[PDB]
Amino acid sequence: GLQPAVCLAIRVNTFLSCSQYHKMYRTVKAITGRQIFQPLHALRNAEKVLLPGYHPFEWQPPLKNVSSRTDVGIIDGLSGLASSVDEYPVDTIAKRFRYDSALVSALMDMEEDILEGMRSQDLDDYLNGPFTVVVKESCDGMGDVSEKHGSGPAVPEKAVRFSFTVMRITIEHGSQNVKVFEEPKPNSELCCKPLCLMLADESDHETLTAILSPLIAEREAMKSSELTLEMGGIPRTFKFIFRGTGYDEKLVREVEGLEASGSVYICTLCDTTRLEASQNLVFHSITRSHAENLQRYEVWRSNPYHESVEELRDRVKGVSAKPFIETVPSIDALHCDIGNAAEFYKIFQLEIGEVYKHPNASKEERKRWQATLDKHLRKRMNLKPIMRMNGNFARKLMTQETVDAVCELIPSEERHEALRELMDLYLKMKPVWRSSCPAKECPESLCQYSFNSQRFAELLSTKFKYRYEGKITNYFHKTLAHVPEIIERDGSIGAWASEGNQSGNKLFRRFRKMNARQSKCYEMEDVLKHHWLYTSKYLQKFMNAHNA
Amino acid sequence: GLQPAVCLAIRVNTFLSCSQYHKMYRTVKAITGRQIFQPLHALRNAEKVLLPGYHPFEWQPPLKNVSSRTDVGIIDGLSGLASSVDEYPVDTIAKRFRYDSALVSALMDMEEDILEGMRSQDLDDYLNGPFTVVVKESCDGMGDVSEKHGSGPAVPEKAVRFSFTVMRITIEHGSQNVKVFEEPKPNSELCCKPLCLMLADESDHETLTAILSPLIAEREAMKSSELTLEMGGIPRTFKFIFRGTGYDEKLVREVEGLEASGSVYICTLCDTTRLEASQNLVFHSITRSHAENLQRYEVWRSNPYHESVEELRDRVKGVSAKPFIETVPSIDALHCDIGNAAEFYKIFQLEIGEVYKHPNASKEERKRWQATLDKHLRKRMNLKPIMRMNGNFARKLMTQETVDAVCELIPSEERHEALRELMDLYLKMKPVWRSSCPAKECPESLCQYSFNSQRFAELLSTKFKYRYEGKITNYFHKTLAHVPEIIERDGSIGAWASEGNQSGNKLFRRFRKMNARQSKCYEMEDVLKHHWLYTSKYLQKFMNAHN
Amino acid sequence: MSLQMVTVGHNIALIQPGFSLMNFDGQVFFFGQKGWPKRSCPTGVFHFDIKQNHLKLKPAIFSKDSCYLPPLRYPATCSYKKHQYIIHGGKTPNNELSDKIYIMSVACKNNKKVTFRCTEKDLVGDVPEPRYGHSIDVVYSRGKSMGVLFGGRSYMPSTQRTTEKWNSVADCLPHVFLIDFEFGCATSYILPELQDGLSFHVSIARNDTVYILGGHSLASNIRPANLYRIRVDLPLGTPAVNCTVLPGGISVSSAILTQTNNDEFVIVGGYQLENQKRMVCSLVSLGDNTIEISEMETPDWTSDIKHSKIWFGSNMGNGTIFLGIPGDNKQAMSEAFYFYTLRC
Amino acid sequence: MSLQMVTVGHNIALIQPGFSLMNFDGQVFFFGQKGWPKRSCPTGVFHFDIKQNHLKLKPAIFSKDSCYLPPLRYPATCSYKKHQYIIHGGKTPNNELSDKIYIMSVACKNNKKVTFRCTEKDLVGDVPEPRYGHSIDVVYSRGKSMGVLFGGRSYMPSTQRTTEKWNSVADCLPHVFLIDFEFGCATSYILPELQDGLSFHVSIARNDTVYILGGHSLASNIRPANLYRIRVDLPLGTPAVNCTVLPGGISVSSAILTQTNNDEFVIVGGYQLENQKRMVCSLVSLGDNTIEISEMETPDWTSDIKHSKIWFGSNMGNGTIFLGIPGDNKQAMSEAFYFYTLRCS
DNA sequence: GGCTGTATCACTGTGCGGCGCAGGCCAGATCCAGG
DNA sequence: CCTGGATCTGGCCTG
DNA sequence: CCTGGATCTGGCCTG
DNA sequence: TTTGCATCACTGTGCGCCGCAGGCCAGATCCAGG
DNA sequence: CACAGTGATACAGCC
DNA sequence: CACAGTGATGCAAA
Ligand SMILES: [Ca+2]
Ligand SMILES: [Ca+2]
Ligand SMILES: [Zn+2]
Ligand SMILES: [Zn+2]
């Protein structure tokens, strides 16, 4: 005899569907006699406690422009968007939770961990102090999401997911803030809770704002309030700090009112140009923000100083659109690693082709250098050739052994020593923006980041001046300029990366294939419910009962 | 308390991996205190009983060029192919069973099925008579089977799978041949047993022959022998019949030594040409075979009559290569449906823009006609516009509601009458090659296939002269000219189709990522063993214990 | 009535439902592109140029004293003759409604290249709320000019708007606003002959009258066949606004209005019902006091317009309509809309 | 030696490892394509035409009396002066070995278009088994001609071949066959100086001698540096075959042999070990009794040949080698092989 | 002695986009050079 | 005979 | 001034 | 009350291929006037 | 310094 | 006439 919460945890954590759990339960009951598991309706009744819209909560003072009804679960993501024939045509299916309901469901799932942290931090148990919750929000479009047949809108073949992850819960005790919770695996798929799932292009700006504006409305509403929640029989108060860092650079340019990546203003953290980035290469400070971008859009739109296009663009520094999502100025660690690996791949193709001696080359010469590099990488590093740079190819490529393999194909020895010092500096700088706490597990590598960055910049300026004279990539400038400032501000890069969101994107296709109804009007509700149910910390403790 | 065979059937049939099963077993044992499930080494110990290489068997006469050992399991599919730098290079990772060991294991995991089937026909369970076992062999190449990193050969990103399916078993009692077993779901993925997995292009002829030649050698050895097998405590005597119907037309043309699909000789069953198939359309007979193709290749190679190349091709009828796998002249029903659906899609597109009245057109207005048809099929029939036509689009397109929706876009009612008559004739003819027994499910629709096919051919010749004068597609000739002879020869066409092998391709794509090691040297053995275990009827009867 | 298909150049994806074509010195321009303005055209105003059935959108710069305005998606446009354009309302690409008034006029003209002047006008007094789908017109009474604004669609007010129904719209109040473009003042007027709200209607301007016909209401969800004449008198004192219900109206929403001849207007396109599309056209001939709406002949609609579900488009000014049809199920590229040109 | 890269036209995928180039009247031809012959070229014999570094394969028809032969993948080719070519053995594209002898000769020549004549010759007597990787040569002794065949690689015999080891090869017996092309007879000769089997070796033909050097054995899996001179005497009675072991041999397998000058041969390419490739060339100068194998200068190998694992290729006949290199990784298109041309003065 | 549990091995996928194309065959323009 | 801008076109940044 | 073949090129069959 | 099973409109396996899309910016490229 | 698998094997602990 | 899911709901049976 198993409890239905235990059978629910076993069904959702071993990736079983309802149609396969029913066969397993039916065979176990019909062969062993007595009913070991529970039927499907008991599990359906048991999962209502973990979904949002179950527990009573109260905001103080009441949030602006939301309803105080507490039994709201999955709702339509369009938010009453008028689909009449006279208006802008909609072609989007969207389902979402309310934001406060998702927050109270996550906190009531994390209840046992919060009480265990208050026990283990030498604190009390009936403390009802102002808990400060830090969450991490992420958004990423997806491709090749093939739409279905049947009646419905003419839906595009993409999808956009919005997620959040509770990162750290503190409490005020005396004067110091002690940490009663901290996520041990922050870039995991187990803790990235879904919030809104829509089927539209990430570059379709009108549909994107029309779906994402209620979320930012609720988020701005609860950015300045206090949530009272009865946790274990005692009411406790919760403040929230929302930190949007799970975005790639293109979406940051889109939703922050900045130009595209090919512009002359390259950094989403400072007002520098691409020519000035290739001359200073280190010395830059973080200046951009959300309020500054709003003020610069108002300067662009009103045009108070009576200038032409070029002088106004130089005044507002590329801010030519209105921002509608507040994001944190930081670096996505995964895409930074992938972009740096692709730039080093281009460096490896140019150094075996003697471009520093022969500045002109045809296209078949470049194809031959690419063919030689791919064949020798298969020979030495056991790396098959791919056209889209992954993260595993990035982690295997940035090694000194790959530099030895490529240096087998270069006749000169000063080019050998130049590539060796370049990869040595890159591997001295890389563990700072990938470790989750670089002040504890690599503090000497954090202390020598500016010296190694200046040495890397001098090496790029001198020994590779056929490639980095008057131009640089954006991720090289992000890696060489702003990393100690982001470490001094946030404490970690890489913990706040968008990698758990991509692992959730891996889970999304699996739940869409084998854990949802195959109907166009029913897929998003089922995928949202099951992905919320998979990331439940209450159900993940039943699967760790053996080590308890 | 569960026996390890029951836990193995639960882990296999609910698509559970070994790691997820270990998690479930660990938490059930930790929260209950009892041992409900069995640990994974007990599942591995009970797993070896169902794999080939466990039971003793004996051949009479012994098989030529085949070993006498009975404990052979998963062997290398290269079969000792030399891989040094002097000779022709290898590029594949292949693993396979022996053919006799796999047929013995497949016959032994359906032991209770054969015993109950000979019980239900009022026979004795101690009969040792000669059982005739006819199987259905299928082979299909796949694409987008992505390569892995690591040490190993330069592998292509394609895969070829060989499989078989035991269709029916028959004992000779008295003067007539009463059947004991019959597969109820022939196109299912629960009955298509994998035999050989390899990583190569199907259009690479040398590597395909080098891997498939040991299997054809074993099959040719077993074609004229007899197998003794102790089943139920009594030795039984089996003899086998092999039917290669699970091939599409492209693989049949490549393997049986015939010309390609766009040739002037269009039928893999007879010797007609495309023009005389476009003139007669009904009146043909099946002439081609494997021995005749070998004789025609010998006539081509020896050139005994001293002819030019064109007169020699006219004498040989396009057999310019040597065949190496014996296939029977049948018709794949799935690709027949897909090809006829694409032909009717082109007919609808050419009927919208009235090519019968204005024969010349640019490609821009052709794209306009295709856009109009796509929008109206999304609006009316709820059909998403697809690029590659598949079977569900064929099943939803071949309706009278679809031609009633298309008839809103064309002005004339003469074309309404023509299209409605054409779709009515096609829907009268389709359940003859789709049903698994047309002599019992639709005998009225079977007995007038000739009249309906002659009416369909006359309607193509008259009301669609602008497209089908001088050229006809291959599957239309196959559909209109041959299938009464094929159903008279066999009894069914849709049962011998290759839909089970495509469902096996789906299972292969699942098992490659979810139930196998992620290594180049270890993925094919794990996928072959797990796909063998998934197809086991002994484990599949455990999941039907509610009866 | 000749219907002719128009091919568009390398920027098909800027034309969206809700664009507006303005006319300056016989040249046609473009406003209301899809998305925020790019770096290839930072102003968003384009040169609408159709010649031998090919459409090329060329960028148009602004003057140094201009205000760089967002692409409004459903504004209220009117010409005001010195010749300029008044736009009000519309949807910002972040789906917020605007209450600004922008005045677009030609600053300087060179050899086939025009520089515009966009000025934002302050509006004080009984101001209208931010809305879209409404109309504006200029009337001339006793040597003075006044802007007559009728209601449209807006969001719920700030004390009634919930995030579960954030994008829900409601029709505006049926008040009539008199906008003075000299001082930027606006006064509202409650008229008892106008009880229902109205949106996406047609508004023809005579000397001192505004003929408002068609429209669609959200409360009862019907398209009423009502016709209202709003007569404005402009004495030395306060103005006198008088509405009058007339028979002969048509059930019309989201139609296109052109002026082919003097005191002669043509209604093209629109929706009679939700799933039913309006394939007929209406000829409106103005007079001194009486108007009449008669039938003209139906133009030869092609097979893809008769089976389309929606259309859009606006007036080019030379008695010529530029209307669009949704393309071959969008997909990646290969044209999302099928554009046409209709001449009268 | 000048090494020069050659671009190939719209049929890159017909050249496979194991092709053979024949030479007729100064023109180079092609045989042994990949796969069975298509309808664009039903014979499989092509016109090997390299001019201003571009290769175009044009089809070549056969005569009406010809036999349409399969593409053999590792035959034994030799020239026999009408001038003709003798091929024996090889692999059919269904991976079966052949024992036929085809005689390729020019039937009629027109303005830059050649029609061939392929005749299959009956072989009776002490016939060799079907094999590949072997060699054949023609010797001239006292106004008569004889074909000298040495052993190669074959499959296991029919009473020793199992389906679990179906594609396993074993070296042939070291017997020497004397093939007469007048009557189609063959007699074998057991010689005590030849104990090991040999495959992929080089065989140079003087008047009545055959110099067999290099090779690779399968039993001991080494490449021996042995050199054998097979002297054939052709009297009125039975022939006398005498082998002689000489010092000076080289450890060579799968090499390319060309004849740049009269009584002067060049060994290009091959494999010295398995993972080790042979980047040196050997100059062989024949005499009346003595031969010597000296060093020549190493040609300037490019960066993709020095780091390739395998090569292949054959002799064009004008002292010019056509060798190939596996396509840089290959993305299933855009040339699966990189070809070169090496000249020798 | 036998049954159960856990570490080890080198790899996987989610990290981007599109359109018809590959292969082969055959007939119809298309063009270049010999009387 | 310039030459002063319109305007394609290809390369480079992020996905 | 033909004209008799080489040879591209696009359309059509199966996947 | 708790179990069990039908019902609903859909899914995928049915083929290929290479760099692309989107945007920005500086250098050719060219066309007609200061 | 992503992280939760993927399955066979080997060896320690234990009953 | 492919076939084994995909999950919520509704109603009959226990
Ligand atoms: Ca993405
Ligand atoms: Ca296939
Ligand atoms: Zn910066
Ligand atoms: Zn036929």
Helix H or strand E segment including B480: helix B474-481
Shortest Cα distance from A297 to chain C (angstroms)? 10
Residue A243, SS3 per DSSP: strand
- The answer to whether the beta carbon of residue B158 comes closer than 7 angstroms to any atom of strand H is yes
Which residues on neighbouring strands pair with residue A235, listed in sequence order? A230
- Contacts of residue B394, Cβ cutoff 8 Å, sequence gap at least 6: B337, B338, B340, B341
HSE-up (13 A, CA, CB side) for residue D174: 19
φ, ψ for residue C272, nearest 5 deg: -85, -40
**C93 cis-preceded (ω within 30 degrees of 0):** no
Contact D255, D216 (CB under 8 A): no
Closest nucleotide over all strands to A333 (CA to C1'): I1
Exposure string of A10-22, with b = 16+ CB inside 10 Å and e = fewer, is bbbbbbbbeebbb
Which DSSP state fits D332? S
Give yes or no for B147 touching C (CB within 8 A): no
* d(C-alpha D47, C-alpha D25), whole Å: 13
Shortest Cα distance from A286 to chain C (angstroms)? 25
**Best to test chain C binding among B366, B368, B378 (most C CBs inside 10 Å):** B368
Ligand lying nearest the CA atom of residue A329? 3
Q: What is the CA radius of gyration of chain C?
A: 20
Q: How far is the CA of A483 from the centre of ligand 3 (A)?
A: 10
Angle at B339 between CA B336 and CA B341, to 5 degrees: 105
* d(C-alpha A134, C-alpha A223), whole Å: 12
CA of B70 to C1' of I13 (A): 38
Assign 3-state DSSP to chain C and report helix, strand, coil percentages, each to 5.
Answer: 5, 45, 50
- List, in sequence order, every beta strand (DSSP E) within A173-255: 177-182, 193-198, 226-231, 234-246
Contact C304, C312 (CB under 8 A): no
Distance of CA A399 to the CA centre of its chain: 26
CA of C256 to C1' of H31 (A): 40
State how far the alpha carbon of B208 is from the alpha carbons of B145, B221, D166, in Å: 17, 20, 14
* d(C-alpha B434, C-alpha B492), whole Å: 8
Q: Which residue is nearest to nucleotide E15 (CA to C1')?
A: A502
Of A93, A221, A60, nearest to C163 (Cα)?
A: A221
Domain count for chain D: 1
The one-letter amino acid at A360: N
* d(C-alpha C81, C-alpha C84), whole Å: 6
- Contacts of residue A324, Cβ cutoff 8 Å, sequence gap at least 6: A209, A212, A213, A216, A255, C94
Among positive and negative, which fits the CA dihedral B181, B185, B186, B190?
negative
Which DSSP state fits D298? P
φ, ψ for residue B317, nearest 5 deg: 60, 55
The C46-51 sheet, strands edge to edge: C7-8, C54-59, C46-51, C27-31, C20-24
The residue written with tokens 């702003």 in the block is A482
CA of B516 to C1' of E14 (A): 19
- Does chain C reach chain B with at least 3 CB pairs under 8 Å? yes
* d(C-alpha D329, C-alpha D306), whole Å: 15
Q: Which domain holds residue C191?
A: 1-344
Which DSSP state fits A171? E
* Residues 99-118/D with CB < 7 A to strand G: 113
Which residues on neighbouring strands pair with residue D20, listed in sequence order? D31
Q: How far is the CA of D48 from the centre of ligand 4 (A)?
A: 40
Of C205, C289, C280, C210, nearest to C242 (Cα)?
A: C210
| D16 chain-B contacts, CB cut-off 8 A | 88
Give yes or no for A67 touching C (CB within 8 A): yes
Asked if D163 lies within 8 A of B217 by C-beta distance, the reply is yes
Contact D341, D321 (CB under 8 A): yes
Q: Which residue is nearest to nucleotide J7 (CA to C1')?
A: A517
* d(C-alpha B83, C-alpha B91), whole Å: 9
Helix H or strand E segment including B431: helix B414-434
State how far the alpha carbon of A219 is from the alpha carbons of A325, A529, B248, C120, in Å: 10, 21, 58, 32
* Residues 361-380/B with CB < 7 A to strand G: 363
Closest nucleotide over all strands to A506 (CA to C1'): E14
A370, A374, A409 member nearest D303 (Cβ)? A409
| A386 chain-D contacts, CB cut-off 8 A | none
Chains that touch C (3 or more CB pairs under 8 A): A, B
Pairing mode of beta strands C7-8, C54-59? parallel
Ligand lying nearest the CA atom of residue A388? 1
What resolution (Å)? 3.1
Pairing mode of beta strands D185-189, D124-125? parallel
- The answer to whether the beta carbon of residue B342 comes closer than 7 angstroms to any atom of strand J is no
* d(C-alpha B491, C-alpha B243), whole Å: 14
* d(C-alpha B358, C-alpha B123), whole Å: 70
A2, A14, A36 member nearest B20 (Cβ)? A14
Measured N-to-C along each axis, helices B99-108 and B111-120 cross at an angle, to the nearest 10 degrees, of 60
The set of strand E positions with any atom below 7 Å of a protein CB reads: 3-6, 10-20, 22-27, 34
* Residues 339-358/A with CB < 7 A to strand F: 339, 342-343
Asked if B151 lies within 8 A of A382 by C-beta distance, the reply is yes
D206 CB neighbour count, 10 Å cutoff? 18
* Residues 33-72/B with CB < 7 A to strand J: none
Give yes or no for A225 touching C (CB within 8 A): no
**A61 cis-preceded (ω within 30 degrees of 0):** yes
Angle at C260 between CA C259 and CA C262, to 5 degrees: 75
- The answer to whether the beta carbon of residue A262 comes closer than 7 angstroms to any atom of strand F is yes
Chains that touch B (3 or more CB pairs under 8 A): A, C, D
Of C232, C218, C130, nearest to C180 (Cα)?
A: C232
* d(C-alpha B536, C-alpha B524), whole Å: 19
Nearest CA in chain B to C338: B368
Of A156, A137, A193, nearest to A528 (Cα)?
A: A193
Of C248, C322, C319, C253, nearest to C290 (Cα)?
A: C248
Contact D251, D215 (CB under 8 A): no
**Best to test chain B binding among A149, A375, A507 (most B CBs inside 10 Å):** A149
Shortest Cα distance from A369 to chain D (angstroms)? 9
CA of C42 to C1' of E14 (A): 37
| D304 chain-A contacts, CB cut-off 8 A | 368, 371-372, 375
* d(C-alpha D230, C-alpha D212), whole Å: 8
Of B336, B338, B350, B341, nearest to B468 (Cα)?
A: B350
| B157 chain-A contacts, CB cut-off 8 A | none
Contact A22, A40 (CB under 8 A): yes
